[PDB]
Write a structure and sequence with these properties.
This protein has helices spanning 14-17, 20-33, 67-78, 102-109, and strands at 37-44, 58-62, 87-90, 93-94, 116-121. Helix content is 30%, strand content 20%. The protein has 127 residues and is an alpha+beta fold. A five-stranded mixed beta sheet has the order 2-1-5-3-4. It contains four helices and five strands. The chain has a single domain, classed as Phosphatidylinositol 3-kinase Catalytic Subunit, Chain A, domain 1 (Ubiquitin-like (UB roll)). The termini are far apart. It is globular, with a radius of gyration of 16 Å. The chain binds magnesium ion (MG).
Length: 127
C-alpha cells in the first residue's frame, strides 16, 4: 500500500516548475548583471502537434533586437520547412513581424514575475 505517482511523462511549464518568488529572484539578479538584456520564456503551445520542442526555455535577448528578428531566430532554431506555419504569441495574442524593440516589448508585455512569456504555434489566430 504505497503511493504511486502518475503523470511523470507530462512536462510542466516554467511557471509550474518554479515558484513565483523564485522566478522573481531570477529576473532581479539577471537584470542587475546584464541590464541591456530581456528575460524571456519561450515554450510550445499546449495543443501543438506539428512544431517540435526545444531543449531550452529560458532566454536572454538584447534590448535592440526586433520582434521580426526574434521570430526568425526562433523559427531558424526549430529547423522547419519554410512553408510551415509559425506564429509567436505574448499573453495569448499573435505578433506581427514588426519593427519594435525587445525593450519596448518588455515594458508593454512583462509578467508580474519579471519575465516575458511567449508561446509558439502552428495554429493561426484567424482562419
Ligand atoms: Mg500542461
Amino acid at each position: 500500500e504505497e503511493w504511486e505517482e502518475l503523470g511523470s511523462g507530462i512536462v510542466p511549464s516554467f511557471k509550474e516548475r518554479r515558484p513565483f518568488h523564485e522566478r522573481q529572484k531570477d529576473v532581479e539578479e539577471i537584470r542587475s548583471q546584464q541590464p541591456n538584456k530581456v528575460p524571456v520564456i519561450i515554450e510550445r503551445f499546449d495543443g501543438e502537434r506539428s512544431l517540435p520542442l526545444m531543449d531550452r526555455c529560458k532566454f536572454l535577448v538584447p534590448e535592440h533586437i526586433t520582434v521580426a528578428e526574434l521570430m526568425s531566430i526562433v523559427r531558424r532554431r526549430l529547423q522547419l520547412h519554410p512553408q510551415q506555419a509559425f506564429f509567436l504569441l505574448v499573453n495569448e495574442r499573435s505578433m506581427v513581424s514588426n519593427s519594435m524593440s525587445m525593450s519596448n516589448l518588455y515594458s508593454q508585455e512583462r509578467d508580474p514575475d519579471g519575465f516575458v512569456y511567449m508561446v509558439y504555434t502552428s495554429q493561426p489566430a484567424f482562419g
